[PDB]
Amino acid sequence: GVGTYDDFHTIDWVREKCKDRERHRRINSKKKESAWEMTKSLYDAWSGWLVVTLTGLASGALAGLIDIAADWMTDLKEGICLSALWYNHEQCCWGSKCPQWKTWAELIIGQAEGPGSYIMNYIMYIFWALSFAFLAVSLVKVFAPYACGSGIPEIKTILSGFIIRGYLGKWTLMIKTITLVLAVASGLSLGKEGPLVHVACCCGNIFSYLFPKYSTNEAKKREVLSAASAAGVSVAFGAPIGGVLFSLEEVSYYFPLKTLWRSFFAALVAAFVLRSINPFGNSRLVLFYVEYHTPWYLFELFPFILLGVFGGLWGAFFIRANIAWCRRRKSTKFGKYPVLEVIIVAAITAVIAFPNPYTRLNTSELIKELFTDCGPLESSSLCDYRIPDRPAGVGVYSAIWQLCLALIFKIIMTVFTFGIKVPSGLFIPSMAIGAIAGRIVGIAVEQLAYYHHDWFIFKEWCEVGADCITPGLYAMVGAAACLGGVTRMTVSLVVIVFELTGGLEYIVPLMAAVMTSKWVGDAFGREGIYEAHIRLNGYPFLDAKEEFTHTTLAADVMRPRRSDPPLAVLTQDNMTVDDIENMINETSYNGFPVIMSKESQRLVGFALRRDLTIAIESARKKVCFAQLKLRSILDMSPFTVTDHTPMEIVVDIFRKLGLRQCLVTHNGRLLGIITKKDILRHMA
Amino acid sequence: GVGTYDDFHTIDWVREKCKDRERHRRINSKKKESAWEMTKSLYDAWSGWLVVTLTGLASGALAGLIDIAADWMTDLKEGICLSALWYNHEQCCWGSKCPQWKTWAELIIGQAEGPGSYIMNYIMYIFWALSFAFLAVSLVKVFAPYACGSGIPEIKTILSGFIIRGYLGKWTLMIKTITLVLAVASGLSLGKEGPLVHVACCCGNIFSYLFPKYSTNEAKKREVLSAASAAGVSVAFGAPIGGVLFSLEEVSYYFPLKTLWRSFFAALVAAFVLRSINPFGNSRLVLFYVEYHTPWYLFELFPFILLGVFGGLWGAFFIRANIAWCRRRKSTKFGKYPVLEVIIVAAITAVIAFPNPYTRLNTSELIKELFTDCGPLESSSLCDYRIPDRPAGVGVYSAIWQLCLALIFKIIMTVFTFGIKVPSGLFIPSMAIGAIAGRIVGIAVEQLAYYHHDWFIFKEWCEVGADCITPGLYAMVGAAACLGGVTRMTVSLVVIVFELTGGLEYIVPLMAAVMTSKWVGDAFGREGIYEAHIRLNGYPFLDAKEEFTHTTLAADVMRPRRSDPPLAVLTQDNMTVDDIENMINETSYNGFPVIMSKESQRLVGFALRRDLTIAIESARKKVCFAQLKLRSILDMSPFTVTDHTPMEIVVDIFRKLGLRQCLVTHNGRLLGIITKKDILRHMA
Numbered sequence A, B: 001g002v003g004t005y006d007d008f009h010t011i012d013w014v015r016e017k018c019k020d021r022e023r024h025r026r027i028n029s030k031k032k033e034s035a036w037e038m039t040k041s042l043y044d045a046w047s048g049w050l051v052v053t054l055t056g057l058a059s060g061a062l063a064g065l066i067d068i069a070a071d072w073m074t075d076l077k078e079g080i081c082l083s084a085l086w087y088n089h090e091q092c093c094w095g096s097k098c099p100q101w102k103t104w105a106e107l108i109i110g111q112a113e114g115p116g117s118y119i120m121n122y123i124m125y126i127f128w129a130l131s132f133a134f135l136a137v138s139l140v141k142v143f144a145p146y147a148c149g150s151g152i153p154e155i156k157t158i159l160s161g162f163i164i165r166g167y168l169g170k171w172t173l174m175i176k177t178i179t180l181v182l183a184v185a186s187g188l189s190l191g192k193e194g195p196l197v198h199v200a201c202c203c204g205n206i207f208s209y210l211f212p213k214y215s216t217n218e219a220k221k222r223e224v225l226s227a228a229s230a231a232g233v234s235v236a237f238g239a240p241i242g243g244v245l246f247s248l249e250e251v252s253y254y255f256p257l258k259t260l261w262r263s264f265f266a267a268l269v270a271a272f273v274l275r276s277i278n279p280f281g282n283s284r285l286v287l288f289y290v291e292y293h294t295p296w297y298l299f300e301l302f303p304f305i306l307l308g309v310f311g312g313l314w315g316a317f318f319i320r321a322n323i324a325w326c327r328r329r330k331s332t333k334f335g336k337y338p339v340l341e342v343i344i345v346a347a348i349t350a351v352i353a354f355p356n357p358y359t360r361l362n363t364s365e366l367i368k369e370l371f372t373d374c375g376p377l378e379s380s381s382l383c384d385y386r387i388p389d390r391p392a393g394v395g396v397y398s399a400i401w402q403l404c405l406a407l408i409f410k411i412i413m414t415v416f417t418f419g420i421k422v423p424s425g426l427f428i429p430s431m432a433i434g435a436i437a438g439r440i441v442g443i444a445v446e447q448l449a450y451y452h453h454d455w456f457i458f459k460e461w462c463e464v465g466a467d468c469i470t471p472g473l474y475a476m477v478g479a480a481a482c483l484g485g486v487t488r489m490t491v492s493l494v495v496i497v498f499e500l501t502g503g504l505e506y507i508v509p510l511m512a513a514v515m516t517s518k519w520v521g522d523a524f525g526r527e528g529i530y531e532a533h534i535r536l537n538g539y540p541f542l543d544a545k546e547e548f549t550h551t552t553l554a555a556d557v558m559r560p561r562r563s564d565p566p567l568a569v570l571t572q573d574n575m576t577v578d579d580i581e582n583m584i585n586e587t588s589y590n591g592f593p594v595i596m597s598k599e600s601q602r603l604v605g606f607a608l609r610r611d612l613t614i615a616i617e618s619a620r621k622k623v624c625f626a627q628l629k630l631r632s633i634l635d636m637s638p639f640t641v642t643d644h645t646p647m648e649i650v651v652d653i654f655r656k657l658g659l660r661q662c663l664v665t666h667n668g669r670l671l672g673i674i675t676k677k678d679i680l681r682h683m684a
């Protein structure tokens, strides 16, 4: 019972490190006594690599299964495959105007064309969208309410030391997997790549419990989960180095500088296991995978910057509009009806996403077609073409018309769709918005070059007889621009994009676009979406970037004040059982310092609520703090800070040593306490 | 005068951070007042990127000039070029049995063959080696005694907070460059890639002084030098990512987690500037550059491990043998004659390195030929060849005979040649030892396959009519094995070997060899060469890996003891000028705590020697610590730690907050102090 942590309170890292040292000393004392002890110590040391290996394996396997099921269910909204009911659209079409794959309209009316067929297909698409959204939201609400959302805002807080009991359990993992598949299939403007960080961390937490070295200790658990988040982003984007950089930058909070190898190994193993999931010989590393072998010119940095500007405004817009909506999702009756919320949102998305062929496609498929340049064989509306460039017809006009509506639709609907009670990600919708913007810009540039190639701006570069601009690169740049504008990631995101879409010729474009998007989004506030949502949920997250603007000291932030009762303290050897029982019943504090005497106020040590209560109960079933005696469980080395200490130092010691509370002493006389809640409240 | 640091002292990072916060507040107060202030603040923020950019530029330029001059003077030992006196051996041989390039023997006797010609060439090679070594060592001894050695053991300490005044000045940089060129040319068993870290850090220190933001502050300077070390390693090996990993792992000690971008940018800029240094169109990224496009088999993983074993023993041997010798270099009259030491060592090296053609070659050229597989046109003794394999004659027997002597010679000489008073590196000689070992193993494997292909072990893999084993791969693996066994680097070294010799097919062999070498070298002690030499020089380096084995508290490490006088302290308002003068004259401490009274021993604050003396001198030219008054320069926030605190916490707070001293308080009563020297001494 002693040394546990209760629900929804932040962790003290120093105590966990001390307990880890105690266990290490216990092991090392026996280590040299016999060879068997050396073998046991080696196994205990390899426990970390075992848990990280299993986390990578599970992340790869679960991401592969999620991708397969999501693809199948997304295709199931548009038709079935009579020859084999367990093949998806692409697999059935490739397995040979196809008679084996039949849409619902052909099944019900028996006619493949006409107003009736379109009506029936529209209705049935709406039906499956509604059914998948219903099943996912209800399953989340009933069996594991923690699966909702991307879960990165919570994983970041958990790695910062926070505690959420079932967030990384087995029911949360199972329901997150199933409901993430169902939600991505439903057609909601959400993703499945951000939520895989939560799945990887769930796997890490589950696999930690197989080793007592990690089950009892918590900081070691945070290290394992930091590796797991790297594995999760790796498997999400297939970018081991990008995943590890994301973990170090966005998610991982505490970094002993040795687990970086563990994070990289976890990412590599996850990517390896995911790559092996290719039963049908797919040629893509990810469902939104594309590569580029075309040039880019210096004048294309003018609009690559412009896209960054877009990525900065939309990002800044999104955090403004989404957070506000999420606010209304809690300060209105809309929050009392989450299943109805998801039903309405999914229905609206399906009704307004079917007419436009770009929004009807799976967002990953949309990102894939937005990264692919127009080939000779392509005759779709996106590449309807009839001099260096190619003449264009009404098809391109209509294509821009449709892409504009797709962009508006997705910008508006991701705002309302991010914070609903079903596993939802933000990487995929943000990339879709950015890619649609980039494709629009690229098509505009291509048409501008074609009509006015005779202008000097293009006369120097564009060569007669060959294509001069590649809109797919513009789309890939806009994806990163918006992704960095919303997440405020700079280098981890750029590495993620580089590994996600192979090719180094576009480091300068991506770098410029991402930097411009972040700098434009910072002019409206330096909050990423995962920090704006951490703020909104009011999670006790000690931001590594937050600055204490007030030029005040630890004097300002102690919270015994003139309007508060006298500081809660403990005497040394005069108090009895009744006094402590009454004080704890009448008070609501997690820990109490121990001092010499009323007139002395000379510090002795620290004690915690849970262990003190446990000891009192044990003593009653079966009071001096000096050398009934509670000497053992008394934290005799509590951190202290002088009132004239400045708040930068207190924040720094909290960040580095992972403090949960620090006493404050004046000339050896105790004054008050400063906990994480105090620093966080006062920082705001 | 207030706030400076004395020579050969250790920086307290917390005070520097507080000063940086004060300056940041000063700037930010004016920042919002006008646009000009915003521009000034933006320039001040860009100061860091400017200094890192200039550090990369200077590292690239200086490494390029050093490489060019080292190549030219290394070739000058063997001949001249009549047509143009400023072209080296390769350039004049390529500029067309060559009549332009003439060796000394043909110039003096006029005959190109015979005993006399060989005698004269041998004598002149010895002469040139002696003269180059003499000039380098004398120039180091006279103009900048700090240029000697690789300088990594000292820079690791400097980035840990230590101060060495002229280590990174302008005379040290100039003399280091010139004498490093001259030493590499001399023919000593040393290198020029480790010392480039010192050149890069010198450049960083020099370029910091151009900005007041970094000149006055020290921790900011430490960040700049951390980036500079990454740039130096990058330019040394042409490996930006490898250089940054080396900086984070080996050299860089304090890591705000934001400068990693600065380190990567510095490395990239250094590599870019170095690559542009190719006036004559050389095809090699580095003078020891080679690439591989051949396979490797699983059975070749046995001796790749074996080389690792070698890399572990030799490494462990070297640190044992070199340190001992370096120890004797201080406990004998040999240390009183450093110029004679270098003369004798260079003379012996030239005398016994000329006869064997493998040791007569520049160690970088030796590493290059050891990395290159035998081509059809090669007729040298290394590849004298007359079934899957190729028949061999007496040439291969003699080649193994010669490579064995080369390995023994290099192993023995690098032991005596590392700690001499002239810029000497250890990457090049260690990689040469490893490459010779790997080439020996590869040739042995190839011959065993040729004679005994009929055995089942090779019958499964080797294909008739084609080569089966590539000794160059074995040499490249052995280089990394020995490099990691001497430096005890695992992942940074592996990335360095990746980027130095392009190709990912060989990750498993390199990783296995490096890990085996480190684990075998750890069985004899977990000290890298740069930590064994830090220990030997007795530098106050707080190792990030050292463990405090004693299960003791902060009480035992207190150094007021029964045999020592009473703790040095100050009274608040009772003492006069005479008392302070006498106490400073009769005592030798850097800082003094301020307490309430003799009978109270209640802490008040902290004071430093230098600023206190400065204030007293100023007061005399033109005594209460309460609210002559010295209130201003009195530190009110000295870190305190209860004696019952355990030493792991003290070590961790020292390593995280960069403490120089921490008081210790007992129930509010001051007891003693714990400085970095105390912890370091007690740790041993």
Ligand SMILES: Nc1ncnc2c1ncn2[C@@H]1O[C@H](COP(=O)(O)O)[C@@H](O)[C@H]1O
Residues within 6 Å of the ligand: A559, A560, A567, A568, A569, A588, A589, A590, A591, A592, A593, A661, A673, A674, A675, A676, A677, A678
């Ligand atoms: N021993 C104590 N005496 C008085 N106030 C306390 C004590 N412990 C905690 N507090 C206050 O109660 C708040 C909530 O406690 P905690 O959950 O420990 O952060 C802290 O932020 C303090 O302001």
Ligand SMILES: Nc1ncnc2c1ncn2[C@@H]1O[C@H](COP(=O)(O)O)[C@@H](O)[C@H]1O
Residues within 6 Å of the ligand: B559, B567, B568, B569, B589, B590, B591, B592, B593, B673, B674, B675, B676, B677, B678
């Ligand atoms: N004011 C002081 N009174 C007594 N010992 C001190 C004081 N300041 C430093 N020391 C000790 O003197 C030794 C050398 O001090 P320093 O070289 O200034 O770190 C260490 O053992 C310190 O703990």
